Amino acid sequence: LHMVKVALAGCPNVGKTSLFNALTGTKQYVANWPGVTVEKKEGVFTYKGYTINLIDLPGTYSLGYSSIDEKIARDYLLKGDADLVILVADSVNPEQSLYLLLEILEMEKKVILAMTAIDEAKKTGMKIDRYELQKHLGIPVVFTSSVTGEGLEELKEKIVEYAQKNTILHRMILDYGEKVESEIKKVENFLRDKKLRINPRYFALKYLSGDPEFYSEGVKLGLPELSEEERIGYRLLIAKRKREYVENVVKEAFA
């Protein structure tokens, strides 16, 4: 078989289960994530000679490391075997989905944005510009509906097209300001010789923000301890910048 492994990421209640079901039908099964009792759901479908293995991640509002659901989702995204990620966004209620998307884009993984429930969005009379989304996010964007079937085949096409690509299309460089960017550069330089399994920019962001995993690992690697005030301060600056970018994307792409 010609296998493509795809993770479905998204906030709770965005339409992940429905999209999963629409794509896999009855070809799905459940188990547990390793070492925990938390359920893992996987499914399969075939498209143009390819076999797509879909894995639904726990719903996550953000990708921190202070709850088992975020630990499972983020561990998989960072350390798992997905060839690409579909970020399932609620088209009617996009803001938190887009925030989560930015976090994942900084991991430098292949991501397709699936704006689902597009049939519901239409009814509200809202106008969503797919071109503006692709421009501001730098990734493929597909409008989908699990009710009407809109976009489902286009999504399958983009999955297989994107999986074949040698690199990621996107490259999400959000300017966090002089002071944060300076510390990022210093951290990257400090770790230049380390064999990190994730890009140094993302690592630096999480370390500076006092992430339970990355801050601890950073210190083990020789980075200095940071005061609680600095960790909170960086975490806040970074989140605030992400939120303002989301707000701008929404202003530009939604009407």
Ligand X SMILES: Nc1nc2c(ncn2[C@@H]2O[C@H](COP(=O)(O)OP(=O)(O)O)[C@@H](O)[C@H]2O)c(=O)[nH]1
Q: Which residues bind ligand X (CB under 6 A)?
A: 10, 12-18, 59, 116-117, 119-120, 145-147
With left for phi above 0 and alpha for psi between -120 and 50, is residue 162 left, alpha or beta?
Answer: alpha
Site string for Mg ion, 91-110 (x = CB under 5 A): --------------------
For residues 118 and 40, the answer to whether their CB atoms sit within 8 Å is no
Name, in order, each residue with C-beta under 8 angstroms of 59's C-beta and a sequence gap of 6 or more.
10, 11, 12, 13, 14, 16, 69
What minimum distance in Å lies between the beta carbon of 90 and ligand X?
8
Q: Which does 147 bind (CB under 5 to 8 A by kind): Mg ion, ligand X, none?
A: ligand X
Take residue 37 and report the two structure tokens written for it: 């009792």
- Which residue, 96 or 116, has its beta carbon nearer to ligand X? 116
Binding mask 62-91 for Mg ion (x = CB under 5 A): ----------------------------x-
138 has binding-site annotation: no
Whether residue 49 is annotated as binding a ligand: the answer is: no
Q: Using CB distances below 5 to 8 A depending on partner kind, what does residue 116 bind out of ligand X, Mg ion, none?
A: ligand X
CB 138 within 8 A of CB 170: yes
**Binding-site sequence positions:** 10-18, 21-22, 24-25, 35-39, 56-59, 90, 117, 119, 146
